[PDB]
Amino acid sequence: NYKLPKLLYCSNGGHFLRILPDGTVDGTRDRSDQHIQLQLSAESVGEVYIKSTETGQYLAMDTDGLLYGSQTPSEECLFLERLEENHYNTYTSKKHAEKNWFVGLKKNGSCKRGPRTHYGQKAILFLPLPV
């Protein structure tokens, strides 16, 4: 469910998804970071917003597949959450779903842009953890 905030842990490099105050999105290995606590909320069934509890910014994906933090919950902020094996989830941009653009992190912690993601990568698998 979606009551409590979560960390989204990425198996690829072992990073928690992070939305920085300047709107940059990346990953960090630092479990104590203030900007990795995310409040997921559901829209329609299987659609979620992913919001920084610290800054209130929403996870968003731009027209080049780059993740960024959005002040407002625009249509670029809706993601399709799908449960995969081992309780890992994927998050697909709803706006770009027909191209299968996933939320993803590289092994160095940088965003893996939507067009470079693909089913099967560790980059796109996120395990929700309690804060």
Given the rule CB under 5 A, which residues bind Cl ion?
112-113, 116
**Cα–Cα nearest to 130, from 16, 47, 46, 28:** 16
Least gap, CB of 20 to Cl ion (angstroms): 17
Q: Could you tell me the CA-to-CA distances from 111 to 23, 66, 101, 130 in Å, in that order? A: 13, 7, 12, 22
54 vs 96, beta carbon nearer Cl ion: 96
Least gap, CB of 2 to Cl ion (angstroms): 29
Least gap, CB of 35 to Cl ion (angstroms): 21
Q: CB within 8 A of 52, min separation 6: which ones?
A: 19, 35, 37, 38, 39, 58, 69
Q: Nearest residue to Cl ion, using CB? A: 113
Give the number of other Cβ atoms within 10 Å of residue 86's Cβ.
8
55 vs 121, beta carbon nearer Cl ion: 121
Least gap, CB of 125 to Cl ion (angstroms): 16
15 vs 51, beta carbon nearer Cl ion: 15
